């Protein structure tokens, strides 16, 4: 007829308040014959013998609830873990009250741990409420604590599942280092300014000093931190105008103890109304039998619904967290904490105080500034991308064409040869041609600067297994684009269904098919329907560029596996290698696009194309995902389609013959 409650509490005044709450718990519950005893223990500066003393004292006491209520501990470990593990050996609920670590959220590790405080990842949902208010989509994540970093990434993907957007940059590294400013500058070069930080006080002060020295706290830079990042020297190193969070009664222990007493008391009076009552045995000596109503009492604690307390509607979810939590939103106005918002369990309301930002006006700074210098990457296409070495030092010889058109070149940067050939030789040379004039037309239509560089290899990019952990990766232009080093691929991109699933496409500027390059008895082949090419031999030598989209289009064709097995022994690096090889009469056929070989037939009369025209497709501009550089650029491309500028580009290279 007795119920024992164990507690690890230090101060005698709060012990007296705890005993007073135990005494007042039996007030409104009638004259029932249940009794409530409480046993509180102090704290030795160690942790092993503390765990020993507490575990054998609570075995000898046979308690039902175990409480740890020590915020101001000098050790920064904050580990009530061993007593919770010892109670989880017999499945006894330990109600943690102080810490908010995400390692306690794992119920597979902490089998019988409950708590009335949520982890900080739920604050990101509050920050998602910022996304419900300030209408901001692209974020920049920075988490140093990797024990909670996977849970923060999980919660972030759970929040972004609704809008189906993507985080622009995520970062995880070892806490303790200092040279993280390179990734800060890489995030600075991005369009967004939203900064989400999840670390301890030392790394927060380190990144505050790094943003202060590099002036990343100017206009438009969105800063959004929590309670751990506004304490200690991080509060001293914080810039003025930063927005932070505050836990209402997060450190106020006296009402929190009474709330915990009310929760435990109503849980015990709920459990007394049901059958199958079991008791914890004397597990110190000769008792390893588990307490059989562990998950039963846990299920009692799952449906615990309350209506008493100064905090309010305390309620457990499936994770045993805190529902309907009042939060405060603070601002740092001239090294002074100024309250600028309140938060109920679903909605943010700013108070009568104004919101003064570190940048300009008091309204929200739209920190989504698009890149005025679009990084352009391309492959060396032979009739389209002419690359010429410089004359004296980084210069371009301004030669004139035969039609009175001056060639407007650009200073591009490119490697010299392949990686076994050239170890490291990347020089700036002169790029011009077809798509360069297309980019000149785009820069004439819309005012934006650019940065033309070249892809490191001579491949488009295929979907290949990386050599560890069985993961798909891309390479080439797609590998340089998806890594964030490139912005817009201006190249004759072969449009297919696989790449449409991953990135968005624009309107095609080129429209052509496929053809066969031969040299001039049947000297022609007339397409794929030659039966000798269905079952080839060592005579008809035909191949294509290694890691090309033509090979992917043939890989989708499940009825031409013989050509896929035949052409893999003769794939070359570039198409010019195939031109030189068939120039020496070593090749016999080559599947390639139409107008390139038409221009090369206009250059060299021995180069002969075939008669058929299959795979009538289009080539456009390689693009990113949903972006404001899509609609206006596509309208500019269609404006180039409707006028005679396509005919002008034909007059430059296509219509011009010899």
């Amino acid at each position: 007829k007795i119920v024992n409650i164990g507690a690890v509490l230090s101060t005698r005044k709060h012990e007296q308040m705890f005993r007073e709450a135990v005494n007042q718990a039996n007030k409104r519950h009638g004259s029932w014959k249940i009794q409530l005893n409480a046993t509180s223990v102090t704290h030795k500066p160690n942790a092993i013998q503390m765990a020993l003393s507490v575990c054998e004292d609570l075995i000898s006491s046979q308690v039902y609830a175990i409480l740890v209520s020590h915020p101001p501990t000098p050790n920064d470990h904050f580990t009530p873990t061993p007593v919770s593990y010892t109670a989880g050996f017999y499945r006894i609920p330990v109600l943690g009250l102080t810490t908010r670590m995400s390692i306690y959220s794992d119920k597979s590790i902490h089998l019988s741990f409950l708590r009335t405080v949520p982890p900080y990842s739920h604050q990101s949902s509050v920050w998602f409420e910022m996304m419900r208010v300030y209408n901001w989509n692209h974020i920049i994540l920075l988490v140093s604590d990797d024990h909670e970093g996977r849970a923060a990434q999980k919660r972030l993907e759970t929040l972004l599942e609704e809008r189906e957007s993507k985080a622009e940059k995520v970062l995880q590294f070892d806490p303790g280092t200092k040279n993280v400013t390179a990734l800060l500058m890489e995030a600075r070069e991005l369009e967004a300014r939203v900064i989400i930080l999840s670390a301890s006080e030392d790394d927060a002060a380190t990144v505050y000093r790094a943003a202060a020295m590099l002036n990343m706290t100017g206009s438009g830079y969105v800063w959004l931190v929590g309670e751990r990042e506004i304490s200690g020297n991080a509060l001293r190193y914080a810039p003025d105008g930063i927005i932070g969070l505050q836990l209402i009664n997060g450190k106020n222990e006296s009402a929190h103890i009474s709330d915990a007493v009310g929760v435990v008391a109503q849980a015990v009076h709920e459990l007394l109304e049901k059958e199958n009552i079991t008791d914890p045995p004397r597990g110190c000596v000769g008792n390893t039998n588990i307490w059989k109503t562990g998950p039963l009492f846990k299920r009692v604690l799952m449906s615990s619904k309350y209506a008493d307390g100064v905090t309010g509607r305390v309620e457990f979810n499936e994770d045993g967290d805190r529902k309907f939590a009042n939060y405060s939103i603070m601002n740092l106005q001239n090294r002074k904490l100024v309250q600028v918002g309140i938060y109920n369990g679903t909605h943010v309301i700013p108070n009568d105080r104004k919101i003064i930002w570190p940048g300009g006006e008091t309204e929200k700074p739209r920190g989504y500034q698009m890149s005025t210098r679009l990084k352009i990457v391309t492959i060396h296409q032979e009739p389209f991308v002419y690359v010429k070495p410089t004359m004296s030092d980084g210069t371009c010889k301004e030669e004139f064409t035969v039609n009175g058109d001056p060639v407007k070149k650009v200073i591009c940067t490119g490697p010299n040869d392949t990686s076994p050939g050239s170890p490291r030789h990347t020089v700036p040379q002169c790029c011009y041609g077809f798509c360069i004039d297309l980019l000149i037309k785009l820069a004439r239509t819309m005012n934006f600067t650019y940065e033309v560089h070249l892809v490191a290899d001579g491949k488009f990019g295929t979907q290949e297994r990386v050599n560890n952990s069985n993961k798909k990766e891309w390479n080439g232009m797609m590998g340089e684009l998806l890594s964030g080093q490139a912005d817009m691929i201006v190249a004759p991109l072969t449009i297919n269904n696989e790449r449409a699933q991953y990135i968005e496409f624009s309107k095609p500027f080129k429209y052509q098919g496929l053809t066969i390059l031969v040299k001039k008895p049947e000297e022609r082949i007339t397409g794929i329907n030659d039966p000798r090419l269905r079952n080839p031999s060592d005579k008809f030598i035909y191949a294509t560029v290694k890691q090309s989209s033509v090979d992917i289009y043939f890989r989708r064709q499940v009825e031409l596996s013989t050509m896929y097995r035949h052409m893999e022994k003769h794939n070359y690096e570039s198409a010019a290698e195939a031109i030189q090889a068939v120039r020496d009469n070593k090749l016999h056929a080559f599947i390639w696009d139409s107008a390139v070989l038409e221009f090369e037939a206009s250059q060299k009369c021995d180069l002969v194309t075939t008669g058929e025209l299959f795979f009538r497709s289009g080539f456009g501009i390689g693009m990113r995902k949903d972006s404001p550089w899509k609609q206006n650029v596509s309208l500019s491309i269609l404006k180039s389609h409707e006028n005679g500028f396509m005919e002008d580009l034909d007059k430059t290279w296509v219509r011009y013959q010899e």
């Binding site: 794992d106 119920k107 590790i109 996977r150 499936e318 297994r465 952990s469 069985n470 993961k471 798909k472």
Partner: protein
């Protein structure tokens, strides 16, 4: 530890599914902890495998099943291979509902991990004869 984690075990089970061309499958996840890492590992493995897995959407749970709202999600299942991540006392009720809903047919498969499959002696009669399990408990190599 000298053991085998659930991630490498999921890798081995998806290797089994790749070696059998069992590409049309499903996934039922309960409230047993360590489950979102399992879902995310399945998502990354499907995104990094040459199969292109035809995966049915995840049947999620909230509590012990009322057989009212979980019934609709279980009646969405029409695929053969069924994956599950739960505890044993949950799996008894899951297999009882699956036999009650007829999900234990000859076409339908059931692959469970080693954490739900406990003692070799304690086998309740509600288990389907043909239950696929993967555990590193090798009787050929003793403790010595």
């Amino acid at each position: 530890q000298f053991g085998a984690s659930i991630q490498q075990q999921a890798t081995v089970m998806l290797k089994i599914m790749q070696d059998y061309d069992w590409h049309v499958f499903s996934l039922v996840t309960t409230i047993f902890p360590g489950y979102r890492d399992f879902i995310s590992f399945i998502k990354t493995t499907v995104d990094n495998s040459f199969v292109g897995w035809d995966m049915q959407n995840v049947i999620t749970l909230d509590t012990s099943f009322e057989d009212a709202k979980t019934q609709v999600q279980l009646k969405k299942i029409h695929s053969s291979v069924i994956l599950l991540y739960c505890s044993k006392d949950e799996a008894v009720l899951i297999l009882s509902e699956a036999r009650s809903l007829g999900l234990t047919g000859y076409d339908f498969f059931w692959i469970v991990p080693s954490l739900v499959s406990g003692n070799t002696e304690l086998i309740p009669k509600e288990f389907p004869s043909g239950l696929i399990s993967v555990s590193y408990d090798d009787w050929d190599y003793s403790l010595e």
